[PDB]
Amino acid sequence: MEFFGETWRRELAAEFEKPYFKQLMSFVADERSRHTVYPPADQVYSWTEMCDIQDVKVVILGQDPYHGPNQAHGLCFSVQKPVPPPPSLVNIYKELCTDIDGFKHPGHGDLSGWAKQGVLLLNAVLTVRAHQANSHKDRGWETFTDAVIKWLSVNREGVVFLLWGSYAHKKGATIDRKRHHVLQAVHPSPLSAHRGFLGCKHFSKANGLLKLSGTEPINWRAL
Ligand SMILES: [Cl-]
Numbered sequence: 692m693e694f695f696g697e698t699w700r701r702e703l704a705a706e707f708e709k710p711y712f713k714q715l716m717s718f719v720a721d722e723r724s725r726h727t728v729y730p731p732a733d734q735v736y737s738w739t740e741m742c743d744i745q746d747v748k749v750v751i752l753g754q755d756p757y758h759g760p761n762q763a764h765g766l767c768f769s770v771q772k773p774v775p776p777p778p779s780l781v782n783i784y785k786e787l788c789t790d791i792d793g794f795k796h797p798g799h800g801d802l803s804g805w806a807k808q809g810v811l812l813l814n815a816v817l818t819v820r821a822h823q824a825n826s827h828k829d830r831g832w833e834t835f836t837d838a839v840i841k842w843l844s845v846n847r848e849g850v851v852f853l854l855w856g857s858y859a860h861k862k863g864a865t866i867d868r869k870r871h872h873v874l875q876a877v878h879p880s881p882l883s884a885h886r887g888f889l890g891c892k893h894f895s896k897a898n899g900l901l902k903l904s905g906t907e908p909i910n911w912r913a914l
Contacts, residue, residue, distance in 0.1 A: 694732075696739035702846070706838050715831030719818055727821040729756050730763040735817050737765025741806035747843060748809035748906055749851045749897050752859040755816035755832075758824055766812035768879075769802035776800035782879040782888060787911055790892045797914040804914040813839060815862055833862075841865055849904035851897045855879055855888065872900045 706712050722728050730737075753767025757777060764771045768780050776784060780800050787794045806812055815836050820826035843850055844867045852871060854863040856878030866873055876891035877883045898908035 694734070694740065695736045696741075696743070698743040698745060699736075699739035702744050702842055703835075703838060706835055711831045711834050715835065718830050719827070722818070722820060722827070728818050728827075729758060729821060730765050730818070734763075734765040738767075738806065738811060738813055741766075741803065742809050744842070745847075746809045747811045747847070747850060748901055749853065749909060750811045750813060750840070750843065751853045752855070752862060753812065753814040754856075754858055755825055755828060756814055756819045758819045758822050758826075760821070763819070765817075766802050766806055767814040768800075769812060770800040772799045772801050774800060778881050779879040779884075782881065782884040786879070786889055786891065787894055789890075790894045791911050794912050799914075802914065805909065805911065808909050808913065810909055811839075811843075815858070837862065837865060844871060847871070849900075849906065851900045853893045853897060856883070872897075 719728065723732065751767060756763035757770060761774055762770045762777070768777075768783060770777060770780070777800070784796050788796065802810075802812055813836055816825070816828050816830075816832040817836070818827045818832070840852075840862065844865060848870045850871045852863055852866055852873045854860050854873060854875045859878075860875055863873060863875075874891075874893050874896055876893060877887040879888045894909075894911050898911075901908045
């Protein structure tokens, strides 16, 4: 309750009283009493604590949280120090190394530095049962995160959405292309990264779009 950013809590307030949200909360509570669920309860909404909703400049969508011990901490693609960057993040860093001048691999996979600058690192599904990918899909989270994307689409303007993978492309269909910028590419996973992600240069393009909208670019190196 206290681990949920105030501006976000206010703008997303309508969701908390909806039937799907109540059922989702009931489900997750049940799961946490019977199994180990990631990320910890107090980090499920970390993405709402790094910056205000009005200051979001870029949005990156993920699927569900990493399901390994000590990995997930509320930000998509990010892992808690000193956990090593998972395969997808390795490719994200690889693209950054060639796309952003002066970018250097930070040696860890904690993306908090980006979130603090206004990069929303949103997983479509916010919890996962330990060791079981997609174990919490189709339980209500997708609707809640759709609400987040919709709020930004309707209430903000000039936000850059980086959609990686078919799943993110579909989820991003709700985004108003007339009010925001949408960049798409295949997923950074080693299974698909070589078919378009590597070379997509979304990070420099994103900053180009921000400058255009009279907004300060993201310092992708600040990790
Ligand atoms: Cl738990």
